[PDB]
């Protein structure tokens, strides 16, 4: 089953970069201070009624607005999720959220890390997950995709101190963006098989007569944007695996194409921006080779699969374990490789039931710092800080002062670049290991061995990293794990929006400079190769101790 | 030259052990091993006391090959700061003498006294002869003589000094040993540019380059990385099994933290501002030097800077009815007596290229007619028609008052020279015009090589003229530069400096007289020379003591053989850690996880075997970089895409495969001695 | 600065037109296009609910085609509590889960061949699975046949009528609907 | 009480510490 899947990656591949260069064309129009085709009229009418127009802020303001949208967007979900019971839509009869609960779900709703330790049939209602839950779905992409357009500015912007418009950007993100293919994914979903209503749980009285109760709700709605924005985070326990949520291998295809729509769509809008394309195939071979061998090495894991299955009495040693029948092996592994490194966090396999060395891969990768067509807006900047770091590297290669599209790299962005990098491995680093001091963290396993300890670096790992995507076997619904992850998720996302926001303001006023025939040329092989093992090299320095006594320990058991 | 010598090698590996105390923590990759060290010291030695259980004997040897390491670090650096200080004080001090001759006449018949040159100061005229010292720098406005200065520049060579005009400039250290001179003291003894320099390498603390400040940040980001990826190491085998001992956590913190290069930035730095004083280049500070190897313009002068000379005869052209042989003869009996430079070049061209070379001087019956300005012709009367040669005009006014009219021929050929670049020079026997020698500037100094040099690294030599633009292209092309200047204003200087920094490039000039000094003063690498002006000099950035033009491709190099020393070093510390993971990490774990037992591919011993080995290669590994930190990294004019290449396939892949090697011949070595 | 005006006004704004707007015109398009899919895809006679197409049901009758094992809170196949077996592929555990299912399914299949497939050992991914790969449905043919009296080339015709293949082959797997099969099969037995 | 951890994290914080304020300075 090598070949089919080879070409599943391949039609995957192909289907992603069609579906993405338009998208990307449209995203570097809207970085641009150019509106979009056809909507200028509602958009000035839309501008005044809002009294957003004439700023023209700098990345202090900028910083300001989006984190302020985002302390407000968690005031109202938690203030939502802890008195749910009041609210409308309870057919249920739902209770109000415990404070631990609600403040880890409030925080992982607004940090685009998407973090669920609850189960959705049976903790909230369905006004909580249709207008909390999406809107905070709908507003942590935009926050990300708001962030990268402020650093497509810096980088495109010649010597002025303004990025731009932070409530303007997120407007035109989230009304046409988002939303408008956020339907069409929607439909798609309840053209094949997935629901959207508002019925009372209905109640089944199936073929063996034992009762049986199927929670409804609005799911597709949520579940298009969950993809698109690379949110994750289920309607229901099972993420993308519930026959609700991901009824059809098109509908899962489609989903893994709404995950890796928007960071290459961004990759190619930085391309078309800065000027020449091939500065942004250049991110995408990064990405794409990344992403290859790892899905490569994540499928035949998992074809080789449990050994003692033979041994038990079975007929085939593939991993079935915690993966669903619609969807091979191959097409699992391929969804986690996909969820895990573009920091998606939504599963149609339990990760927890994987082979040791196919389920390293994905948490490597969200050791590594999610770059490989990582977040939403949230990947292309911390790929752009690596990108920094090779270039630094590269300038003292040659001999030169550091450079990246003619704009020079000195102490103001390396400070910030640095602490941007170890903002992430501190807080895994540190999790991990206040998780495994305390008893309340200790006896949270499900797994003996090492796999225990894999599931908590894969848990706060993901916290860390604003994944979301669990070994869902950790019982993390303690007060201290709800805190702790909640913590985590909160540092892990803004103090990386931070320092690549003041990197951005750093950067843009610095005038560009020609290619003068002498210049490292960041497009081609050469740099690609460069970066690439930039990034695996730095994501495997400073966690191989720390994987070894998890996955490699248990592959090696 | 300096190769490593034990008469000073020794002497600062004494100086080595005054660095541990507080002179670490300013180096704080360094502070951190030398604190891991002072930890695992105190483990061993509450261990061997009976406090703590298990090998003492092995936390003792972690705890001495840490010390090493970092007395190793602190050796690079006091063997840097060992010859940087030996060129320095080998430059300074070759003659101290209080001689004043204080007095207040410039002439000849002044008097003399004993006051020391730390008081003779703020511009006095001092009167030095033959075999005396010149006690300070200054102008020579009155003498001229033949000064040695291999005291100071280093050079074997006599020099003439010509006072007044173009040499017009004297050093403190030199020796006059043909006539008299006059030494004016300028500026104060102490803030020359050997002051500068000496106060900069011995003494006073010198600044980092914000290069080196960038790459310290990077460093420190990545020993806060590797130290929380080896400490809540312990917590991550307390539920795995047994806990793993604390100096095995150093001993892989160590082995992991960059010090490969953080021991080696003040090596690499101090060796790079040691090549700079060796090249007879004074800088006073890296950042300029670190600048200098970034910038991708040249801006360089012609009068002295090129064209070594002035115009001089390179062609003949005889236009009609004249053959070049006699043409020839006929301007060799006319600058027979002509005792200038274009003359001498007149006389040696014509003897090359018609063999005459034997002259009959007694039988001319000529009386030799020497230079005249009142006139400005020259020549001889060699016949009853006399011969004079001169400037073009004063030519046609005595041929016209002789009786004869301007030639055609003659007027197309002086117009041909004119628009080709040279100077016309025009010889006329008696009321018949002969030819026209054509003579451009000759630069004679071999730059053309040092510019195709330019050309391959890729920087733009822009060349600078004071004449009209066609004798500037016509010289541009033999000199070969891509780009030429004319009309040379120091306002028009100025806008074509300011039109390159504000394009986004950096600049670099080499200016020596005083009337660029605003243009040294704004631009970013200003190679002042020995021989330019004092006021120049200190108001440049650098010094030139050889005075070559052709310097700054040698402080290019430098400068960026110290950023490519660093980036390379830097790339082999971190590519250098997988074989410390490959050595340590199933030799950590062995006693708690005997399942990744399989993780040692090369094979090893034991445990405390592959641990040792691995920290004995980290402590040797900075005495075998030591000759590449001092020496810097082969430099090859290359593109841009090409010397990353080989810069990665070397020092990356040796970072990859490199340590490999070490590690199993130390642990083969440790095994052979029975020590496991 | 001082933008709470804009802020409140941005955030109230996205709130509606992504909470009360974007869910409310995606129900009412989903309702008023697909309104079978929409409604959870159920299967309904005699004014009764027999479960949906796409959930699937704990079948422990000896003349029915088995599902997956379930790995669900309270009971097997239980929607209220989703999620299969977080349990590790180095789990002793879970090899004695394996153990006994793949004993009790060679006990309940003797005509079968000793050759059990993954998939009726193995636990879901969601807790509840409806499909099962027709090359795992033909292992409990001669069982089924057996039990009702029916014929192999009968119940060939019925599984490959109630096999739903993907538009591309190596995008997903070739799979049944047990439940449709198992209503399907009971109304032809009756 | 809980010495050999309460030492060893109190250190490695403040390793950390003196880090990344070597981070922030231009020392
Ligand atoms: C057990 C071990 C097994 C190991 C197996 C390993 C196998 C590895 C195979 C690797 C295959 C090589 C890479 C694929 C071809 C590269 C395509 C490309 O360069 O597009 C550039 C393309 C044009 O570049 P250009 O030539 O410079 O032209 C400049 C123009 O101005 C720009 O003009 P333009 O961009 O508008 O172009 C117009 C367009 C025409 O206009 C159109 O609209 C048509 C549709 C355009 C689609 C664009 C898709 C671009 C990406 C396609 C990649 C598909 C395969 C990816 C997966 C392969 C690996 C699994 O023309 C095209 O460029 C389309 C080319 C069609 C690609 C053909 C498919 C590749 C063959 C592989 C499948 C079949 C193999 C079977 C046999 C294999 C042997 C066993 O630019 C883009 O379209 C943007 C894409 C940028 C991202 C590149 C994506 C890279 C993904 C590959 C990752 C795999 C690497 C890891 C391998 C292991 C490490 C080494
Ligand atoms: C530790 C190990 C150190 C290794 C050091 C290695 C140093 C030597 C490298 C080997 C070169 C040998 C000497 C040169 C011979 C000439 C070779 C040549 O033609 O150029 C190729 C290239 C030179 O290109 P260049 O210098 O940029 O300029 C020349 C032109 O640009 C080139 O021509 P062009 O670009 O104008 O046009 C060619 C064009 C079409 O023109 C042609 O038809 C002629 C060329 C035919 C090529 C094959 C036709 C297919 C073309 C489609 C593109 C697909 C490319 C292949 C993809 C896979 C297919 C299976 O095909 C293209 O490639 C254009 C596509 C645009 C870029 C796509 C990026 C490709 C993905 C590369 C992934 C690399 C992953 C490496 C694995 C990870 C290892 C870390 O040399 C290489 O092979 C480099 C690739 C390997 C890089 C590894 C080095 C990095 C590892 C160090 C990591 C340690 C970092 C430590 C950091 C620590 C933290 C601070
Ligand atoms: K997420
Ligand atoms: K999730
Ligand atoms: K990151
Ligand atoms: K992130
Ligand atoms: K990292
Ligand atoms: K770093
Ligand atoms: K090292």
């Given at each position: 089953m090598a070949?089919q899947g080879?070409?599943l990656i391949?039609?995957?591949?192909?289907?992603?970069?069609?579906?993405?260069?338009?998208?990307?064309?449209?995203?570097?129009?809207?970085?641009?201070?150019?509106?979009?085709?056809?909507?200028?009229?509602?958009?000035?009418?839309?501008?005044?009624?809002?009294?957003?127009?004439?700023?023209?802020?700098?990345?202090?303001?900028?910083?300001?607005?989006?984190?302020?949208?985002?302390?407000?967007?968690?005031?109202?979900?938690?203030?939502?999720?802890?008195?749910?019971?009041?609210?409308?839509?309870?057919?249920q009869?739902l209770?109000?959220?415990s404070?631990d609960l609600?403040?880890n779900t409030?925080?992982s709703?607004?940090?685009?890390t998407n973090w669920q330790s609850y189960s959705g049939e049976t903790t909230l209602?369905?006004?909580?997950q249709?207008?909390?839950?999406?809107?905070?779905?709908?507003?942590?992409?935009?926050?990300?995709?708001?962030?990268?357009?402020?650093?497509?500015?810096?980088?495109?912007?010649?010597?002025?101190?303004?990025?731009?418009?932070?409530?303007?950007?997120?407007?035109?993100?989230?009304?046409?963006?988002?939303?408008?293919?956020?339907?069409?994914?929607?439909?798609?979903?309840?053209?094949?098989g997935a629901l959207?209503?508002?019925?009372?749980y209905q109640a089944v009285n199936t073929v063996e007569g034992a009762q049986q109760l199927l929670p409804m709700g609005?799911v597709?709605?949520?579940e298009?944007?969950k993809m698109?924005?690379?949110?994750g985070g289920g309607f229901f326990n099972a993420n993308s695996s519930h026959p609700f949520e991901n009824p059809t291998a098109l509908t899962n295809f489609?989903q893994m194409?709404?995950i890796?729509?928007?960071?290459?769509?961004?990759?190619?809008?930085?391309?078309?921006?800065?000027?020449?394309?091939?500065?942004?195939?250049?991110?995408?071979?990064?990405?794409?080779?990344?992403?290859?061998?790892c899905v490569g090495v994540v499928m035949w894991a998992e074809v080789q699969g449990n050994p003692h299955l033979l041994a038990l009495g079975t007929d085939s040693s593939i991993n079935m374990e915690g993966k669903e029948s619609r969807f091979g092996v191959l097409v699992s592994s391929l969804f986690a490789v996909v969820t895990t490194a573009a920091s998606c966090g939504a599963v149609i396999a339990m990760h927890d039931s994987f082979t040791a060395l196919g389920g390293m891969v994905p948490m490597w990768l969200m050791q590594?710092?999610?770059?490989?067509?990582?977040?939403?807006?949230?990947?292309?900047?911390?790929?752009?800080?690596?990108?920094?770091?090779?270039?630094?590297?590269?300038?003292?290669?040659?001999?030169?002062?550091?450079?990246?599209?003619?704009?020079?790299?000195?102490?103001?962005?390396?400070?910030?670049?640095?602490?941007?990098?170890?903002?992430?491995?501190?807080?895994v680093?540190?999790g991990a290991a206040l998780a495994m001091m305390t008893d309340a963290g200790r006896s949270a396993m499900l797994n003996p061995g090492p796999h225990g300890f894999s599931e908590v670096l894969y848990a706060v790992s993901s916290a860390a990293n604003?994944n979301g995507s669990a070994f869902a076997g950790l019982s993390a619904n303690s007060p201290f794990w709800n805190?702790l992850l909640?913590?985590c998720?909160?540092?892990?996302?803004?103090?990386?929006?931070?320092?690549?926001?003041?990197?951005?303001?750093?950067?843009?006023?610095?005038?560009?400079?020609?290619?003068?025939?002498?210049?490292?040329?960041?497009?081609?092989?050469?740099?690609?190769?460069?970066?690439?093992?930039?990034?695996?090299?730095?994501?495997?320095?400073?966690f191989?101790?720390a994987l070894a006594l998890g996955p490699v320990a248990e592959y090696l058991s | 030259?300096?190769?490593?010598?034990?008469?000073?090698?020794?002497?600062?590996?004494?100086?080595?052990?005054?660095?541990?105390?507080?002179?670490?923590?300013?180096?704080?990759?360094?502070?951190?091993?030398?604190?891991?060290?002072?930890?695992?010291?105190?483990?061993?030695?509450?261990?061997?006391?009976?406090?703590?259980?298990?090998?003492?004997?092995?936390?003792?040897?972690?705890?001495?090959?840490?010390?090493?390491?970092?007395?190793?670090?602190?050796?690079?650096?006091?063997?840097?700061?060992?010859?940087?200080?030996?060129?320095?004080?080998?430059?300074?001090?070759?003659?101290?003498?209080?001689?004043?001759?204080?007095?207040?006449?410039?002439?000849?018949?002044?008097?003399?006294?004993?006051?020391?040159?730390?008081?003779?100061?703020?511009?006095?005229?001092?009167?030095?002869?033959?075999?005396?010292?010149?006690?300070?720098?200054?102008?020579?406005?009155?003498?001229?003589?033949?000064?040695?200065?291999?005291?100071?520049?280093?050079?074997?060579?006599?020099?003439?000094?010509?006072?007044?005009?173009?040499?017009?400039?004297?050093?403190?250290?030199?020796?006059?040993?043909?006539?008299?001179?006059?030494?004016?003291?300028?500026?104060?003894?102490?803030?020359?540019?050997?002051?500068?320099?000496?106060?900069?390498?011995?003494?006073?603390?010198?600044?980092?380059?914000?290069?080196?400040?960038?790459?310290?940040?990077?460093?420190?980001?990545?020993?806060?990385?590797?130290?929380?990826?080896?400490?809540?190491?312990?917590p991550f085998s307390a539920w795995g099994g047994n806990?793993?001992?604390?100096?095995?956590?150093?001993?892989?913190?160590?082995?992991?933290?960059?010090?490969?290069?953080?021991?080696?930035?003040?090596?690499?730095?101090?060796?790079?501002?040691?090549?700079?004083?060796?090249?007879?280049?004074?800088?006073?500070?890296?950042?300029?030097?670190?600048?200098?190897?970034?910038?991708?313009?040249?801006?360089?002068?012609?009068?002295?800077?090129?064209?070594?000379?002035?115009?001089?005869?390179?062609?003949?052209?005889?236009?009609?009815?004249?053959?070049?042989?006699?043409?020839?003869?006929?301007?060799?009996?006319?600058?027979?007596?002509?005792?200038?430079?274009?003359?001498?070049?007149?006389?040696?061209?014509?003897?090359?290229?018609?063999?005459?070379?034997?002259?009959?001087?007694?039988?001319?019956?000529?009386?030799?007619?020497?230079?005249?300005?009142?006139?400005?012709?020259?020549?001889?009367?060699?016949?009853?028609?006399?011969?004079?040669?001169?400037?073009?005009?004063?030519?046609?006014?005595?041929?016209?008052?002789?009786?004869?009219?301007?030639?055609?021929?003659?007027?197309?050929?002086?117009?041909?020279?004119?628009?080709?670049?040279?100077?016309?020079?025009?010889?006329?026997?008696?009321?018949?015009?002969?030819?026209?020698?054509?003579?451009?500037?000759?630069?004679?100094?071999?730059?053309?090589?040092?510019?195709?040099?330019?050309?391959?690294?890729?920087?733009?030599?822009?060349?600078?003229?004071?004449?009209?633009?066609?004798?500037?292209?016509?010289?541009?092309?033999?000199?070969?530069?891509?780009?030429?200047?004319?009309?040379?204003?120091?306002?028009?200087?100025?806008?074509?400096?300011?039109?390159?920094?504000?394009?986004?490039?950096?600049?670099?000039?080499?200016?020596?007289?005083?009337?660029?000094?605003?243009?040294?003063?704004?631009?970013?690498?200003?190679?002042?020379?020995?021989?330019?002006?004092?006021?120049?000099?200190?108001?440049?950035?650098?010094?030139?003591?050889?005075?070559?033009?052709?310097?700054?491709?040698?402080?290019?190099?430098?400068?960026?053989?110290?950023?490519?020393?660093?980036?390379?070093?830097?790339?082999?510390?971190?590519?250098?850690?997988?074989?410390?993971?490959?050595?340590?990490?199933?030799?950590?774990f062995?006693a708690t996880y005997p399942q990744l037992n399989a993780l040692?591919?090369?094979?090893?011993?034991?445990?405390?075997?592959?641990?040792?080995?691995?920290?004995?290669?980290?402590?040797?590994?900075?005495?075998?970089?030591?000759?590449?930190?001092?020496?810097?990294?082969?430099?090859?004019?290359?593109?841009?895409?090409?010397?990353?290449?080989?810069?990665?396939?070397?020092?990356?892949?040796?970072?990859?495969?490199?340590?490999?090697?070490?590690?199993?011949?130390?642990?083969?070595?440790?095994?052979?001695?029975?020590?496991? | 600065?001082?933008?709470?005006?804009?802020?409140?006004?941005?955030?109230?704004?996205?709130?509606?037109?992504?909470?009360?707007?974007?869910?409310?015109?995606?129900?009412?398009?989903?309702?008023?296009?697909?309104?079978?899919?929409?409604?959870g895809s159920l299967i309904?006679?005699?004014?009764?609910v027999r479960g949906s197409a796409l959930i699937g049901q704990n079948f422990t009758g000896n003349g029915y085609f088995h599902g997956r094992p379930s790995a669900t809170a309270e009971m097997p196949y239980n929607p209220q509590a989703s999620g299969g077996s977080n349990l590790a592929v180095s789990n002793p555990e879970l090899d004695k889960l394996i153990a006994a299912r793949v004993a009790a399914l060679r006990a309940a299949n003797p005509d079968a061949s000793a050759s059990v497939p993954v998939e009726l050992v193995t636990a879901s991914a969601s807790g509840l699975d409806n499909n099962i790969t027709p090359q795992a449905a033909a292992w409990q043919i001669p069982r089924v046949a057996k039990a009702r009296?029916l014929?192999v080339?009968?119940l060939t015709?019925l599984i490959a009528?109630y096999s739903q293949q993907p538009?591309?082959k190596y995008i997903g797997q070739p799979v049944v609907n047990i439940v449709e099969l198992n209503l399907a099969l009971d109304?032809?037995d009756? | 009480?809980?010495?050999?951890?309460?030492?060893?994290?109190?250190?490695?914080?403040?390793?950390?510490?003196?880090?990344?304020?070597?981070?922030?300075?231009?020392?």
């Amino acid at each position: 089953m090598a070949a089919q899947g080879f070409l599943l990656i391949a039609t995957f591949l192909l289907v992603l970069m069609v579906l993405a260069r338009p998208l990307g064309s449209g995203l570097a129009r809207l970085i641009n201070d150019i509106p979009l085709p056809g909507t200028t009229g509602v958009e000035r009418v839309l501008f005044r009624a809002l009294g957003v127009s004439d700023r023209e802020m700098n990345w202090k303001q900028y910083l300001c607005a989006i984190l302020g949208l985002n302390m407000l967007g968690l005031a109202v979900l938690f203030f939502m999720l802890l008195g749910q019971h009041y609210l409308p839509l309870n057919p249920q009869q739902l209770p109000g959220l415990s404070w631990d609960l609600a403040l880890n779900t409030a925080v992982s709703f607004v940090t685009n890390t998407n973090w669920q330790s609850y189960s959705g049939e049976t903790t909230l209602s369905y006004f909580s997950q249709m207008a909390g839950l999406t809107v905070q779905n709908f507003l942590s992409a935009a926050s990300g995709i708001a962030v990268i357009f402020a650093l497509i500015r810096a980088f495109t912007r010649q010597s002025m101190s303004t990025l731009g418009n932070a409530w303007v950007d997120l407007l035109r993100i989230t009304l046409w963006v988002l939303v408008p293919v956020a339907l069409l994914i929607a439909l798609f979903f309840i053209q094949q098989g997935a629901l959207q209503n508002f019925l009372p749980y209905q109640a089944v009285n199936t073929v063996e007569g034992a009762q049986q109760l199927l929670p409804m709700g609005p799911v597709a709605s949520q579940e298009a944007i969950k993809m698109l924005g690379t949110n994750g985070g289920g309607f229901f326990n099972a993420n993308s695996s519930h026959p609700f949520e991901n009824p059809t291998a098109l509908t899962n295809f489609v989903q893994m194409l709404a995950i890796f729509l928007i960071p290459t769509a961004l990759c190619f809008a930085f391309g078309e921006v800065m000027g020449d394309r091939r500065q942004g195939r250049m991110l995408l071979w990064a990405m794409s080779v990344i992403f290859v061998i790892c899905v490569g090495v994540v499928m035949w894991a998992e074809v080789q699969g449990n050994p003692h299955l033979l041994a038990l009495g079975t007929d085939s040693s593939i991993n079935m374990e915690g993966k669903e029948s619609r969807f091979g092996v191959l097409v699992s592994s391929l969804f986690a490789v996909v969820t895990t490194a573009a920091s998606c966090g939504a599963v149609i396999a339990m990760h927890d039931s994987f082979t040791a060395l196919g389920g390293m891969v994905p948490m490597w990768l969200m050791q590594i710092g999610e770059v490989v067509f990582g977040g939403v807006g949230s990947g292309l900047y911390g790929m752009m800080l690596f990108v920094l770091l090779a270039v630094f590297i590269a300038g003292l290669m040659i001999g030169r002062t550091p450079e990246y599209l003619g704009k020079k790299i000195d102490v103001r962005e390396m400070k910030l670049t640095a602490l941007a990098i170890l903002v992430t491995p501190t807080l895994v680093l540190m999790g991990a290991a206040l998780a495994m001091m305390t008893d309340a963290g200790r006896s949270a396993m499900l797994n003996p061995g090492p796999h225990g300890f894999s599931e908590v670096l894969y848990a706060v790992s993901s916290a860390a990293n604003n994944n979301g995507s669990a070994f869902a076997g950790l019982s993390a619904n303690s007060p201290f794990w709800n805190c702790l992850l909640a913590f985590c998720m909160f540092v892990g996302r803004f103090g990386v929006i931070i320092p690549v926001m003041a990197i951005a303001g750093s950067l843009v006023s610095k005038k560009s400079q020609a290619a003068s025939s002498g210049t490292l040329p960041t497009h081609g092989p050469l740099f690609v190769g460069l970066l690439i093992g930039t990034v695996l090299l730095v994501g495997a320095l400073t966690f191989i101790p720390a994987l070894a006594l998890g996955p490699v320990a248990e592959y090696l058991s | 030259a300096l190769f490593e010598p034990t008469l000073v090698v020794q002497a600062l590996k004494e100086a080595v052990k005054k660095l541990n105390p507080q002179a670490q923590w300013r180096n704080p990759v360094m502070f951190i091993v030398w604190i891991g060290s002072l930890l695992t010291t105190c483990i061993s030695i509450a261990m061997a006391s009976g406090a703590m259980p298990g090998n003492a004997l092995f936390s003792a040897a972690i705890s001495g090959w840490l010390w090493i390491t970092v007395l190793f670090a602190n050796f690079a650096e006091a063997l840097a700061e060992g010859r940087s200080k030996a060129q320095a004080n080998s430059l300074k001090g070759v003659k101290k003498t209080a001689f004043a001759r204080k007095l207040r006449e410039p002439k000849y018949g002044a008097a003399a006294d004993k006051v020391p040159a730390d008081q003779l100061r703020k511009g006095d005229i001092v009167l030095v002869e033959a075999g005396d010292i010149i006690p300070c720098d200054g102008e020579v406005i009155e003498g001229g003589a033949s000064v040695d200065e291999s005291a100071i520049t280093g050079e074997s060579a006599p020099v003439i000094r010509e006072s007044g005009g173009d040499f017009a400039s004297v050093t403190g250290g030199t020796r006059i040993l043909s006539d008299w001179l006059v030494i004016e003291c300028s500026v104060n003894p102490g803030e020359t540019f050997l002051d500068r320099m000496i106060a900069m390498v011995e003494g006073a603390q010198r600044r980092k380059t914000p290069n080196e400040i960038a790459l310290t940040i990077l460093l420190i980001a990545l020993t806060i990385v590797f130290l929380l990826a080896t400490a809540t190491l312990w917590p991550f085998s307390a539920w795995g099994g047994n806990a793993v001992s604390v100096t095995v956590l150093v001993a892989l913190l160590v082995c992991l933290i960059p010090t490969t290069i953080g021991g080696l930035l003040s090596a690499i730095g101090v060796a790079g501002m040691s090549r700079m004083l060796g090249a007879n280049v004074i800088a006073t500070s890296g950042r300029a030097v670190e600048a200098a190897g970034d910038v991708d313009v040249l801006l360089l002068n012609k009068t002295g800077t090129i064209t070594l000379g002035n115009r001089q005869a390179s062609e003949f052209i005889p236009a009609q009815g004249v053959d070049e042989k006699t043409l020839a003869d006929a301007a060799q009996l006319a600058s027979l007596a002509d005792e200038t430079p274009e003359g001498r070049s007149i006389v040696i061209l014509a003897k090359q290229r018609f063999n005459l070379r034997e002259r009959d001087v007694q039988s001319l019956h000529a009386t030799f007619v020497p230079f005249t300005a009142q006139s400005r012709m020259s020549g001889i009367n060699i016949d009853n028609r006399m011969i004079r040669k001169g400037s073009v005009d004063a030519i046609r006014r005595h041929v016209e008052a002789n009786g004869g009219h301007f030639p055609t021929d003659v007027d197309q050929k002086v117009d041909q020279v004119a628009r080709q670049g040279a100077t016309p020079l025009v010889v006329v026997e008696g009321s018949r015009v002969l030819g026209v020698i054509a003579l451009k500037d000759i630069v004679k100094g071999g730059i053309k090589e040092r510019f195709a040099q330019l050309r391959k690294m890729g920087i733009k030599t822009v060349m600078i003229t004071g004449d009209n633009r066609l004798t500037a292209a016509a010289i541009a092309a033999e000199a070969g530069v891509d780009d030429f200047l004319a009309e040379a204003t120091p306002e028009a200087k100025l806008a074509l400096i300011r039109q390159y920094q504000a394009e986004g490039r950096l600049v670099a000039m080499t200016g020596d007289g005083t009337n660029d000094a605003p243009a040294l003063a704004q631009a970013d690498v200003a190679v002042a020379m020995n021989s330019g002006t004092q006021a120049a000099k200190e108001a440049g950035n650098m010094v030139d003591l050889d005075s070559n033009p052709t310097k700054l491709i040698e402080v290019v190099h430098i400068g960026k053989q110290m950023l490519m020393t660093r980036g390379s070093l830097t790339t082999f510390s971190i590519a250098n850690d997988v074989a410390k993971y490959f050595a340590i990490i199933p030799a950590a774990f062995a006693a708690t996880y005997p399942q990744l037992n399989a993780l040692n591919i090369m094979c090893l011993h034991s445990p405390d075997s592959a641990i040792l080995s691995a920290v004995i290669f980290n402590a040797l590994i900075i005495v075998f970089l030591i000759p590449l930190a001092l020496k810097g990294v082969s430099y090859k004019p290359l593109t841009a895409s090409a010397m990353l290449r080989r810069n990665l396939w070397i020092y990356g892949l040796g970072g990859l495969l490199v340590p490999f090697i070490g590690i199993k011949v130390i642990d083969l070595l440790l095994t052979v001695c029975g020590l496991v | 600065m001082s933008g709470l005006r804009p802020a409140l006004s941005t955030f109230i704004f996205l709130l509606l037109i992504t909470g009360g707007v974007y869910p409310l015109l995606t129900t009412v398009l989903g309702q008023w296009w697909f309104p079978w899919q929409a409604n959870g895809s159920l299967i309904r006679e005699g004014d009764t609910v027999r479960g949906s197409a796409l959930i699937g049901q704990n079948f422990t009758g000896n003349g029915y085609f088995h599902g997956r094992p379930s790995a669900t809170a309270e009971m097997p196949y239980n929607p209220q509590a989703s999620g299969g077996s977080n349990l590790a592929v180095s789990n002793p555990e879970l090899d004695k889960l394996i153990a006994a299912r793949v004993a009790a399914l060679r006990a309940a299949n003797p005509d079968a061949s000793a050759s059990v497939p993954v998939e009726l050992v193995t636990a879901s991914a969601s807790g509840l699975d409806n499909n099962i790969t027709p090359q795992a449905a033909a292992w409990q043919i001669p069982r089924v046949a057996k039990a009702r009296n029916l014929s192999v080339e009968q119940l060939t015709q019925l599984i490959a009528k109630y096999s739903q293949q993907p538009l591309v082959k190596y995008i997903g797997q070739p799979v049944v609907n047990i439940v449709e099969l198992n209503l399907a099969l009971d109304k032809l037995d009756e | 009480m809980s010495a050999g951890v309460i030492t060893g994290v109190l250190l490695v914080f403040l390793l950390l510490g003196y880090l990344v304020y070597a981070l922030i300075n231009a020392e």
